[PDB]
Design an enzyme around this catalytic site. Structure first.
Site, short mmCIF file in Angstrom:
data_model
loop_
_atom_site.label_atom_id
_atom_site.label_comp_id
_atom_site.label_asym_id
_atom_site.label_seq_id
_atom_site.Cartn_x
_atom_site.Cartn_y
_atom_site.Cartn_z
N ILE A 67 99.69 -29.94 -56.38
CA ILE A 67 100.97 -29.94 -57.09
C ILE A 67 101.64 -28.56 -57.07
O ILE A 67 102.84 -28.46 -56.83
CB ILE A 67 100.83 -30.54 -58.52
CG1 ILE A 67 102.19 -30.83 -59.16
CG2 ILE A 67 100.00 -29.64 -59.43
CD1 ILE A 67 103.01 -31.90 -58.47
N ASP A 68 100.88 -27.50 -57.30
CA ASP A 68 101.44 -26.14 -57.28
C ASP A 68 100.32 -25.09 -57.21
O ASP A 68 99.14 -25.47 -57.27
CB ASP A 68 102.41 -25.92 -58.47
CG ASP A 68 101.70 -25.72 -59.80
OD1 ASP A 68 100.51 -26.07 -59.92
OD2 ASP A 68 102.37 -25.19 -60.73
N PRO A 69 100.65 -23.78 -57.06
CA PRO A 69 99.60 -22.78 -56.83
C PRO A 69 98.62 -22.63 -57.97
O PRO A 69 98.84 -23.20 -59.03
CB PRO A 69 100.38 -21.50 -56.63
CG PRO A 69 101.68 -21.95 -56.07
CD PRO A 69 101.99 -23.20 -56.84
N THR A 130 100.61 -23.89 -65.26
CA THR A 130 100.77 -24.88 -64.19
C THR A 130 102.03 -25.75 -64.36
O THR A 130 102.38 -26.16 -65.47
CB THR A 130 99.52 -25.78 -64.03
OG1 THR A 130 99.67 -26.61 -62.86
CG2 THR A 130 99.29 -26.68 -65.26
N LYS A 131 102.71 -25.98 -63.24
CA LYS A 131 103.92 -26.80 -63.15
C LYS A 131 105.13 -26.25 -63.92
O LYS A 131 106.13 -26.94 -64.10
CB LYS A 131 103.62 -28.25 -63.55
CG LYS A 131 102.61 -28.90 -62.63
CD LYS A 131 102.40 -30.36 -62.98
CE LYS A 131 101.47 -30.51 -64.17
NZ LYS A 131 101.21 -31.95 -64.45
#
Ligand SMILES: O=c1cc[nH]c(=O)[nH]1
Ligand SMILES: O=c1cc[nH]c(=O)[nH]1
Ligand SMILES: [Cl-]
Ligand SMILES: [Cl-]
Ligand SMILES: [Cl-]
Ligand SMILES: [K+]
Ligand SMILES: [K+]
EC number: 3.2.2.27
Lengths: 218, 218
Positions: A67-69, A130-131
Protein backbone atom coordinates in the site's frame (compact mmCIF):
# COMPACT_ATOMS: atom_id res chain seq x y z
CA UNK A 1 16.64 6.55 -20.01
CA UNK A 2 15.03 10.00 -20.21
CA UNK A 3 13.90 12.51 -17.59
CA UNK A 4 11.38 15.28 -17.02
CA UNK A 5 11.42 18.24 -14.65
CA UNK A 6 8.82 19.00 -11.97
CA UNK A 7 8.37 22.35 -10.21
CA UNK A 8 8.91 20.96 -6.70
CA UNK A 9 11.38 18.54 -5.10
CA UNK A 10 12.88 16.25 -6.23
CA UNK A 11 12.69 18.58 -9.31
CA UNK A 12 13.81 15.92 -11.82
CA UNK A 13 12.40 12.42 -12.43
CA UNK A 14 14.56 9.93 -14.34
CA UNK A 15 12.62 7.07 -15.98
CA UNK A 16 12.85 4.06 -18.31
CA UNK A 17 11.16 4.42 -21.74
CA UNK A 18 8.47 1.84 -20.82
CA UNK A 19 6.94 4.57 -18.62
CA UNK A 20 6.84 7.25 -21.39
CA UNK A 21 3.05 7.01 -21.95
CA UNK A 22 2.26 8.29 -18.41
CA UNK A 23 5.06 10.80 -17.73
CA UNK A 24 3.17 13.82 -19.11
CA UNK A 25 0.15 13.18 -16.86
CA UNK A 26 2.54 12.37 -13.99
CA UNK A 27 4.29 15.76 -14.23
CA UNK A 28 0.94 17.60 -14.22
CA UNK A 29 -0.50 15.49 -11.38
CA UNK A 30 2.64 15.72 -9.22
CA UNK A 31 2.96 19.51 -9.65
CA UNK A 32 -0.60 19.83 -8.26
CA UNK A 33 -0.05 17.85 -5.03
CA UNK A 34 3.67 18.01 -4.25
CA UNK A 35 3.42 20.85 -1.72
CA UNK A 36 1.14 18.65 0.42
CA UNK A 37 3.77 15.90 0.42
CA UNK A 38 6.80 18.09 1.16
CA UNK A 39 5.46 19.88 4.28
CA UNK A 40 5.99 16.65 6.24
CA UNK A 41 9.14 14.62 6.76
CA UNK A 42 8.58 11.58 4.51
CA UNK A 43 9.45 7.92 3.96
CA UNK A 44 11.16 7.72 1.63
CA UNK A 45 12.94 11.06 1.20
CA UNK A 46 11.65 12.88 -1.95
CA UNK A 47 14.74 12.06 -4.10
CA UNK A 48 13.71 8.38 -3.78
CA UNK A 49 9.95 8.76 -4.40
CA UNK A 50 10.15 7.63 -8.02
CA UNK A 51 13.24 5.41 -8.10
CA UNK A 52 11.20 2.37 -9.35
CA UNK A 53 10.41 4.28 -12.58
CA UNK A 54 13.98 3.43 -13.60
CA UNK A 55 12.82 -0.21 -13.88
CA UNK A 56 11.73 -1.71 -17.22
CA UNK A 57 8.18 -3.06 -17.58
CA UNK A 58 8.19 -5.18 -20.77
CA UNK A 59 10.24 -7.91 -19.08
CA UNK A 60 7.92 -8.02 -16.03
CA UNK A 61 5.11 -10.53 -15.46
CA UNK A 62 4.31 -10.12 -11.75
CA UNK A 63 3.76 -6.89 -9.82
CA UNK A 64 4.11 -7.36 -6.05
CA UNK A 65 2.26 -4.40 -4.56
CA UNK A 66 2.13 -2.98 -1.03
CA UNK A 67 0.00 0.00 0.00
CA UNK A 68 2.80 2.49 0.84
CA UNK A 69 6.43 2.72 2.10
CA UNK A 70 7.74 1.63 5.49
CA UNK A 71 6.67 4.31 8.03
CA UNK A 72 10.40 4.85 8.57
CA UNK A 73 13.55 4.14 6.51
CA UNK A 74 11.79 3.48 3.18
CA UNK A 75 14.38 3.42 0.37
CA UNK A 76 12.08 3.97 -2.58
CA UNK A 77 12.36 0.24 -3.40
CA UNK A 78 9.21 -1.35 -1.95
CA UNK A 79 9.83 -3.73 0.97
CA UNK A 80 13.60 -3.20 0.74
CA UNK A 81 15.43 -3.30 4.07
CA UNK A 82 19.20 -3.12 3.39
CA UNK A 83 19.99 -4.21 6.97
CA UNK A 84 17.14 -6.80 6.98
CA UNK A 85 15.43 -5.41 10.10
CA UNK A 86 11.87 -4.73 8.87
CA UNK A 87 9.25 -7.31 9.84
CA UNK A 88 7.48 -7.30 6.46
CA UNK A 89 10.46 -8.41 4.36
CA UNK A 90 11.67 -10.87 7.01
CA UNK A 91 8.22 -12.51 6.95
CA UNK A 92 8.32 -12.62 3.15
CA UNK A 93 11.79 -14.21 3.24
CA UNK A 94 10.62 -16.75 5.84
CA UNK A 95 7.76 -17.82 3.54
CA UNK A 96 10.07 -18.10 0.52
CA UNK A 97 12.61 -19.99 2.64
CA UNK A 98 9.88 -22.53 3.45
CA UNK A 99 8.88 -22.91 -0.22
CA UNK A 100 12.44 -23.05 -1.64
CA UNK A 101 14.37 -24.93 1.04
CA UNK A 102 16.81 -22.01 1.37
CA UNK A 103 17.48 -21.87 5.13
CA UNK A 104 20.76 -19.90 5.34
CA UNK A 105 20.53 -16.31 4.13
CA UNK A 106 21.35 -12.78 5.31
CA UNK A 107 18.54 -10.86 3.57
CA UNK A 108 15.88 -10.74 0.88
CA UNK A 109 14.96 -8.25 -1.84
CA UNK A 110 11.96 -8.51 -4.21
CA UNK A 111 13.65 -6.06 -6.59
CA UNK A 112 16.42 -8.49 -7.73
CA UNK A 113 13.94 -11.18 -8.93
CA UNK A 114 13.60 -11.81 -12.68
CA UNK A 115 10.08 -10.94 -13.89
CA UNK A 116 9.01 -9.20 -10.66
CA UNK A 117 8.42 -5.48 -10.13
CA UNK A 118 7.85 -4.57 -6.50
CA UNK A 119 5.47 -1.61 -6.17
CA UNK A 120 3.88 0.66 -3.59
CA UNK A 121 0.43 2.01 -4.41
CA UNK A 122 1.18 5.29 -2.60
CA UNK A 123 4.76 6.50 -3.12
CA UNK A 124 5.22 8.19 0.26
CA UNK A 125 3.90 8.47 3.76
CA UNK A 126 4.33 11.11 6.43
CA UNK A 127 7.23 9.87 8.55
CA UNK A 128 5.97 7.21 11.00
CA UNK A 129 2.35 7.22 9.79
CA UNK A 130 1.04 4.61 7.33
CA UNK A 131 -1.30 5.76 4.52
CA UNK A 132 -1.01 9.39 5.65
CA UNK A 133 -0.47 10.53 2.03
CA UNK A 134 -3.25 8.46 0.43
CA UNK A 135 -5.35 11.43 -0.62
CA UNK A 136 -2.44 13.17 -2.34
CA UNK A 137 -1.05 10.24 -4.36
CA UNK A 138 -4.50 8.88 -5.31
CA UNK A 139 -4.69 10.06 -8.97
CA UNK A 140 -1.02 9.30 -9.61
CA UNK A 141 -1.41 5.92 -7.85
CA UNK A 142 -4.22 4.82 -10.17
CA UNK A 143 -2.40 6.20 -13.23
CA UNK A 144 0.84 4.36 -12.48
CA UNK A 145 -0.58 1.02 -11.34
CA UNK A 146 -2.97 0.88 -14.32
CA UNK A 147 0.12 1.37 -16.47
CA UNK A 148 1.83 -1.58 -14.72
CA UNK A 149 -1.23 -3.81 -15.28
CA UNK A 150 -0.82 -3.22 -19.03
CA UNK A 151 2.47 -5.14 -18.81
CA UNK A 152 2.26 -7.78 -16.07
CA UNK A 153 0.28 -11.04 -16.14
CA UNK A 154 -0.36 -11.14 -12.35
CA UNK A 155 -0.96 -8.31 -9.86
CA UNK A 156 -0.36 -9.53 -6.30
CA UNK A 157 -1.46 -7.02 -3.67
CA UNK A 158 -0.74 -7.49 0.05
CA UNK A 159 -3.30 -6.34 2.63
CA UNK A 160 -6.95 -7.38 2.46
CA UNK A 161 -8.30 -4.17 3.98
CA UNK A 162 -5.75 -1.87 2.29
CA UNK A 163 -6.70 -3.26 -1.13
CA UNK A 164 -10.43 -3.88 -0.48
CA UNK A 165 -11.50 -1.80 -3.51
CA UNK A 166 -8.51 -2.38 -5.85
CA UNK A 167 -10.52 -4.12 -8.62
CA UNK A 168 -13.10 -1.34 -9.04
CA UNK A 169 -10.22 1.15 -8.83
CA UNK A 170 -8.18 -0.35 -11.69
CA UNK A 171 -10.92 -1.89 -13.85
CA UNK A 172 -8.21 -4.20 -15.22
CA UNK A 173 -8.45 -7.51 -17.20
CA UNK A 174 -5.27 -8.73 -15.46
CA UNK A 175 -5.17 -11.56 -12.93
CA UNK A 176 -5.34 -9.98 -9.46
CA UNK A 177 -4.68 -11.69 -6.12
CA UNK A 178 -5.23 -9.80 -2.85
CA UNK A 179 -3.46 -11.64 -0.03
CA UNK A 180 -2.68 -11.11 3.62
CA UNK A 181 -0.18 -8.47 4.65
CA UNK A 182 2.78 -9.83 6.68
CA UNK A 183 1.38 -8.10 9.82
CA UNK A 184 -2.19 -9.48 9.34
CA UNK A 185 -3.70 -10.64 12.65
CA UNK A 186 -2.96 -14.08 14.07
CA UNK A 187 -0.06 -14.87 11.70
CA UNK A 188 -2.37 -15.41 8.70
CA UNK A 189 0.45 -14.43 6.30
CA UNK A 190 2.57 -17.55 6.93
CA UNK A 191 -0.30 -19.81 5.78
CA UNK A 192 -1.09 -17.62 2.73
CA UNK A 193 -0.49 -19.57 -0.51
CA UNK A 194 -0.12 -16.55 -2.83
CA UNK A 195 3.50 -17.15 -3.95
CA UNK A 196 2.49 -20.67 -5.00
CA UNK A 197 -0.79 -19.56 -6.61
CA UNK A 198 1.06 -16.92 -8.68
CA UNK A 199 3.30 -19.56 -10.26
CA UNK A 200 0.36 -21.87 -11.01
CA UNK A 201 -1.43 -18.99 -12.78
CA UNK A 202 1.67 -17.90 -14.71
CA UNK A 203 2.31 -21.42 -16.05
CA UNK A 204 -1.40 -21.59 -16.97
CA UNK A 205 -0.88 -18.30 -18.83
CA UNK A 206 2.06 -19.87 -20.74
CA UNK A 207 4.71 -17.93 -18.78
CA UNK A 208 7.67 -19.06 -16.70
CA UNK A 209 7.14 -19.31 -12.95
CA UNK A 210 8.84 -16.77 -10.68
CA UNK A 211 12.06 -18.06 -9.18
CA UNK A 212 11.42 -16.55 -5.73
CA UNK A 213 14.78 -17.81 -4.40
CA UNK A 214 16.50 -15.16 -6.58
CA UNK A 215 15.44 -12.63 -3.92
CA UNK A 216 17.84 -14.06 -1.32
CA UNK A 217 20.99 -12.23 -0.22
CA UNK A 218 23.97 -14.20 1.13
CA UNK B 1 -38.74 -24.55 -6.35
CA UNK B 2 -40.20 -21.14 -7.10
CA UNK B 3 -40.84 -19.55 -10.46
CA UNK B 4 -41.30 -16.08 -11.90
CA UNK B 5 -43.29 -14.82 -14.85
CA UNK B 6 -41.84 -13.07 -17.89
CA UNK B 7 -43.83 -11.21 -20.55
CA UNK B 8 -42.71 -13.37 -23.50
CA UNK B 9 -41.77 -16.99 -24.11
CA UNK B 10 -40.85 -19.10 -22.21
CA UNK B 11 -43.29 -17.13 -19.95
CA UNK B 12 -42.30 -18.89 -16.69
CA UNK B 13 -38.78 -19.35 -15.35
CA UNK B 14 -38.42 -21.95 -12.62
CA UNK B 15 -35.35 -21.54 -10.42
CA UNK B 16 -33.55 -23.00 -7.41
CA UNK B 17 -33.55 -20.73 -4.33
CA UNK B 18 -29.77 -20.06 -4.67
CA UNK B 19 -30.64 -17.81 -7.67
CA UNK B 20 -33.33 -15.83 -5.75
CA UNK B 21 -31.24 -12.61 -5.45
CA UNK B 22 -30.97 -12.06 -9.25
CA UNK B 23 -34.48 -13.10 -10.34
CA UNK B 24 -36.29 -9.73 -10.18
CA UNK B 25 -33.49 -8.07 -12.18
CA UNK B 26 -33.50 -11.02 -14.62
CA UNK B 27 -37.24 -10.59 -15.27
CA UNK B 28 -36.76 -6.86 -15.88
CA UNK B 29 -33.80 -7.28 -18.27
CA UNK B 30 -35.40 -10.20 -20.12
CA UNK B 31 -38.71 -8.34 -20.65
CA UNK B 32 -36.70 -5.46 -22.19
CA UNK B 33 -35.19 -7.52 -25.03
CA UNK B 34 -37.25 -10.72 -25.54
CA UNK B 35 -39.47 -9.21 -28.25
CA UNK B 36 -36.41 -8.51 -30.45
CA UNK B 37 -34.66 -11.80 -29.56
CA UNK B 38 -37.75 -13.87 -30.43
CA UNK B 39 -37.74 -12.59 -34.03
CA UNK B 40 -35.25 -15.47 -34.55
CA UNK B 41 -35.31 -19.24 -34.35
CA UNK B 42 -32.95 -20.13 -31.54
CA UNK B 43 -30.54 -22.64 -30.13
CA UNK B 44 -31.75 -23.72 -27.70
CA UNK B 45 -35.54 -23.33 -27.91
CA UNK B 46 -36.86 -20.63 -25.53
CA UNK B 47 -38.28 -23.23 -23.09
CA UNK B 48 -34.69 -24.39 -22.51
CA UNK B 49 -32.94 -20.98 -22.21
CA UNK B 50 -33.03 -21.01 -18.42
CA UNK B 51 -32.87 -24.66 -17.43
CA UNK B 52 -29.51 -24.27 -15.65
CA UNK B 53 -31.24 -21.94 -13.14
CA UNK B 54 -32.67 -25.16 -11.74
CA UNK B 55 -29.20 -26.11 -10.46
CA UNK B 56 -28.06 -25.24 -6.94
CA UNK B 57 -24.99 -23.00 -6.55
CA UNK B 58 -24.03 -23.60 -2.88
CA UNK B 59 -22.47 -27.00 -3.64
CA UNK B 60 -20.54 -25.67 -6.68
CA UNK B 61 -16.84 -24.87 -6.59
CA UNK B 62 -16.05 -24.72 -10.34
CA UNK B 63 -17.88 -23.05 -13.20
CA UNK B 64 -16.94 -24.18 -16.72
CA UNK B 65 -18.15 -21.44 -18.99
CA UNK B 66 -18.59 -21.36 -22.76
CA UNK B 67 -19.56 -18.31 -24.83
CA UNK B 68 -22.97 -19.46 -26.06
CA UNK B 69 -24.91 -22.60 -27.13
CA UNK B 70 -24.21 -24.86 -30.10
CA UNK B 71 -25.41 -23.08 -33.28
CA UNK B 72 -27.74 -26.03 -33.74
CA UNK B 73 -29.23 -28.55 -31.28
CA UNK B 74 -28.39 -26.70 -28.06
CA UNK B 75 -30.26 -28.29 -25.16
CA UNK B 76 -30.01 -25.55 -22.52
CA UNK B 77 -27.25 -27.52 -20.79
CA UNK B 78 -23.90 -26.03 -21.95
CA UNK B 79 -21.78 -28.43 -24.09
CA UNK B 80 -24.36 -31.21 -23.84
CA UNK B 81 -24.79 -33.48 -26.86
CA UNK B 82 -27.19 -36.41 -26.15
CA UNK B 83 -25.86 -38.39 -29.14
CA UNK B 84 -22.25 -37.28 -28.45
CA UNK B 85 -21.84 -35.80 -31.92
CA UNK B 86 -20.68 -32.22 -31.26
CA UNK B 87 -17.00 -31.43 -31.66
CA UNK B 88 -16.60 -29.36 -28.47
CA UNK B 89 -17.76 -32.05 -26.02
CA UNK B 90 -15.87 -34.78 -27.92
CA UNK B 91 -12.70 -32.71 -27.47
CA UNK B 92 -13.53 -32.11 -23.78
CA UNK B 93 -14.03 -35.87 -23.28
CA UNK B 94 -10.71 -36.65 -25.01
CA UNK B 95 -8.90 -34.19 -22.77
CA UNK B 96 -10.51 -35.72 -19.66
CA UNK B 97 -9.72 -39.23 -21.01
CA UNK B 98 -5.98 -38.43 -21.18
CA UNK B 99 -6.11 -36.84 -17.70
CA UNK B 100 -8.05 -39.67 -16.02
CA UNK B 101 -7.02 -42.79 -17.97
CA UNK B 102 -10.63 -43.62 -18.86
CA UNK B 103 -10.41 -45.07 -22.40
CA UNK B 104 -13.83 -46.70 -22.93
CA UNK B 105 -16.81 -44.34 -22.86
CA UNK B 106 -19.81 -43.53 -25.04
CA UNK B 107 -20.21 -39.88 -24.04
CA UNK B 108 -19.47 -37.06 -21.62
CA UNK B 109 -21.61 -34.48 -19.82
CA UNK B 110 -20.20 -31.65 -17.70
CA UNK B 111 -23.55 -31.29 -15.85
CA UNK B 112 -23.37 -34.62 -13.95
CA UNK B 113 -20.15 -33.84 -12.07
CA UNK B 114 -20.21 -33.04 -8.35
CA UNK B 115 -18.99 -29.50 -7.73
CA UNK B 116 -19.22 -28.31 -11.35
CA UNK B 117 -21.77 -26.04 -13.02
CA UNK B 118 -21.33 -25.73 -16.81
CA UNK B 119 -22.46 -22.35 -18.11
CA UNK B 120 -22.91 -20.35 -21.31
CA UNK B 121 -22.25 -16.61 -21.06
CA UNK B 122 -24.99 -15.86 -23.63
CA UNK B 123 -28.03 -18.11 -23.19
CA UNK B 124 -29.09 -18.38 -26.86
CA UNK B 125 -27.95 -17.76 -30.39
CA UNK B 126 -29.82 -17.20 -33.63
CA UNK B 127 -29.99 -20.68 -35.17
CA UNK B 128 -26.73 -21.40 -37.01
CA UNK B 129 -24.96 -18.17 -35.96
CA UNK B 130 -22.41 -18.09 -33.13
CA UNK B 131 -22.49 -15.07 -30.76
CA UNK B 132 -25.44 -13.63 -32.70
CA UNK B 133 -27.44 -12.87 -29.54
CA UNK B 134 -24.74 -11.08 -27.53
CA UNK B 135 -26.65 -7.84 -28.19
CA UNK B 136 -29.72 -9.15 -26.32
CA UNK B 137 -28.07 -11.07 -23.46
CA UNK B 138 -25.42 -8.45 -22.54
CA UNK B 139 -26.88 -7.24 -19.22
CA UNK B 140 -28.37 -10.57 -18.20
CA UNK B 141 -25.09 -12.33 -18.98
CA UNK B 142 -23.16 -10.08 -16.61
CA UNK B 143 -25.84 -10.40 -13.92
CA UNK B 144 -25.95 -14.19 -13.94
CA UNK B 145 -22.19 -14.85 -14.21
CA UNK B 146 -21.43 -12.39 -11.40
CA UNK B 147 -23.88 -14.28 -9.21
CA UNK B 148 -22.17 -17.59 -10.03
CA UNK B 149 -18.76 -16.12 -9.14
CA UNK B 150 -20.04 -15.39 -5.58
CA UNK B 151 -20.29 -19.16 -5.09
CA UNK B 152 -17.60 -20.89 -7.13
CA UNK B 153 -13.91 -20.92 -6.29
CA UNK B 154 -12.66 -21.19 -9.89
CA UNK B 155 -14.15 -19.86 -13.11
CA UNK B 156 -12.85 -21.61 -16.23
CA UNK B 157 -13.80 -19.76 -19.43
CA UNK B 158 -13.33 -21.30 -22.87
CA UNK B 159 -12.37 -18.87 -25.67
CA UNK B 160 -9.25 -16.69 -25.46
CA UNK B 161 -10.69 -13.91 -27.61
CA UNK B 162 -14.28 -14.19 -26.38
CA UNK B 163 -13.30 -13.94 -22.72
CA UNK B 164 -10.14 -11.78 -22.95
CA UNK B 165 -11.67 -8.89 -20.94
CA UNK B 166 -13.82 -11.04 -18.58
CA UNK B 167 -11.99 -10.18 -15.32
CA UNK B 168 -12.77 -6.48 -15.93
CA UNK B 169 -16.49 -7.27 -16.43
CA UNK B 170 -16.83 -9.46 -13.35
CA UNK B 171 -14.72 -7.41 -10.93
CA UNK B 172 -14.62 -10.54 -8.76
CA UNK B 173 -12.24 -12.18 -6.23
CA UNK B 174 -12.97 -15.54 -7.93
CA UNK B 175 -10.00 -17.21 -9.59
CA UNK B 176 -10.65 -16.87 -13.31
CA UNK B 177 -8.75 -18.84 -15.91
CA UNK B 178 -9.23 -18.22 -19.63
CA UNK B 179 -8.27 -21.16 -21.84
CA UNK B 180 -8.48 -22.11 -25.52
CA UNK B 181 -11.84 -23.17 -26.96
CA UNK B 182 -12.05 -26.85 -28.05
CA UNK B 183 -11.98 -25.83 -31.77
CA UNK B 184 -8.89 -23.55 -31.54
CA UNK B 185 -6.78 -23.94 -34.70
CA UNK B 186 -3.48 -25.84 -34.58
CA UNK B 187 -5.24 -27.98 -31.93
CA UNK B 188 -4.23 -25.75 -29.01
CA UNK B 189 -7.03 -26.99 -26.76
CA UNK B 190 -5.39 -30.44 -26.66
CA UNK B 191 -2.21 -28.96 -25.12
CA UNK B 192 -4.24 -27.03 -22.48
CA UNK B 193 -3.69 -28.13 -18.85
CA UNK B 194 -6.65 -26.19 -17.41
CA UNK B 195 -8.75 -29.18 -16.33
CA UNK B 196 -5.80 -30.64 -14.44
CA UNK B 197 -4.72 -27.31 -12.94
CA UNK B 198 -8.25 -26.59 -11.68
CA UNK B 199 -7.74 -29.24 -8.95
CA UNK B 200 -4.35 -27.74 -8.02
CA UNK B 201 -6.01 -24.29 -7.64
CA UNK B 202 -8.88 -25.83 -5.63
CA UNK B 203 -6.39 -27.52 -3.24
CA UNK B 204 -4.63 -24.19 -2.68
CA UNK B 205 -8.08 -22.73 -1.89
CA UNK B 206 -8.68 -25.51 0.70
CA UNK B 207 -11.46 -27.04 -1.44
CA UNK B 208 -11.99 -30.62 -2.57
CA UNK B 209 -10.96 -31.74 -6.05
CA UNK B 210 -13.32 -32.32 -8.96
CA UNK B 211 -13.63 -35.97 -10.05
CA UNK B 212 -13.75 -35.24 -13.78
CA UNK B 213 -14.42 -38.96 -14.53
CA UNK B 214 -17.98 -38.49 -13.20
CA UNK B 215 -18.74 -36.79 -16.52
CA UNK B 216 -18.38 -39.99 -18.57
CA UNK B 217 -21.38 -41.82 -19.95
CA UNK B 218 -20.85 -45.54 -20.62
O1 LIG C 1 7.42 -0.83 0.99
C1 LIG C 1 6.60 -1.38 1.75
C2 LIG C 1 7.02 -1.81 2.99
C3 LIG C 1 6.10 -2.42 3.83
N1 LIG C 1 4.82 -2.56 3.43
C4 LIG C 1 4.44 -2.14 2.21
O2 LIG C 1 3.25 -2.25 1.85
N2 LIG C 1 5.32 -1.55 1.38
O1 LIG D 1 -22.80 -25.02 -24.91
C1 LIG D 1 -21.81 -24.73 -25.61
C2 LIG D 1 -21.60 -25.42 -26.78
C3 LIG D 1 -20.52 -25.10 -27.56
N1 LIG D 1 -19.70 -24.11 -27.17
C4 LIG D 1 -19.90 -23.44 -26.02
O2 LIG D 1 -19.11 -22.52 -25.70
N2 LIG D 1 -20.95 -23.76 -25.24
CL1 LIG E 1 -4.37 -8.35 5.53
CL1 LIG F 1 -18.76 -27.72 -31.31
CL1 LIG G 1 -9.52 -19.82 -28.22
K1 LIG H 1 3.35 0.47 4.84
K1 LIG I 1 -21.07 -21.74 -29.43
Amino acid sequence: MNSVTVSHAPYTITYHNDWEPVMSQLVEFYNEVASWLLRDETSPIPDKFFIQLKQPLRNKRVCVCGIDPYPKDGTGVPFESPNFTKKSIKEIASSISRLTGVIDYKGYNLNIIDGVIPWNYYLSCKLGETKSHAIYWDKISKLLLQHITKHVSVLYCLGKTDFSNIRAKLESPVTTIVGYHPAARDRQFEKDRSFEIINVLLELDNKAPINWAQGFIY
